[PDB]
Amino acid sequence: GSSGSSGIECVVCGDKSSGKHYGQFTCEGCKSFFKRSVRRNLTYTCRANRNCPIDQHHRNQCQYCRLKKCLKVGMRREAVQRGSGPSSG
Numbered sequence: 001g002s003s004g005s006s007g008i009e010c011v012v013c014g015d016k017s018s019g020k021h022y023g024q025f026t027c028e029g030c031k032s033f034f035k036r037s038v039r040r041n042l043t044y045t046c047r048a049n050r051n052c053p054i055d056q057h058h059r060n061q062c063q064y065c066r067l068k069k070c071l072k073v074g075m076r077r078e079a080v081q082r083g084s085g086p087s088s089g
């Protein structure tokens with residue numbers, strides 16, 4: 001009985017997802033935040049116990065946690081880069 005909403009929500013922060021991005025439904029805020037890191041191959045180090053609350057009603061939250069949450073919820077990196085997607089083991 002969890003119905004009655006306005007469109008899809010961001011599985012990362014909850015923000016109204018702007019459509020299925022990277023295989024998963026994520027908002028525009030995380031949509032870019034995920035790529036900018038994926039396409040760039042970045043890697044943040046959560047100074048915390050990787051338990052930072054990645055919500056929407058919260059200013060710039062953790063980076064590693066927020067970014068990771070993507071690979072957790074479902075967001076796939078392969079997508080970030082269209083075309084052939086090789087594997088570096």
Ligand SMILES: [Zn+2]
Pocket residue numbers: 010011012013014015026027028029030031
């Ligand atoms: Zn989001």
Ligand SMILES: [Zn+2]
Pocket residue numbers: 046047048049050051052062063064065066
């Ligand atoms: Zn964190």
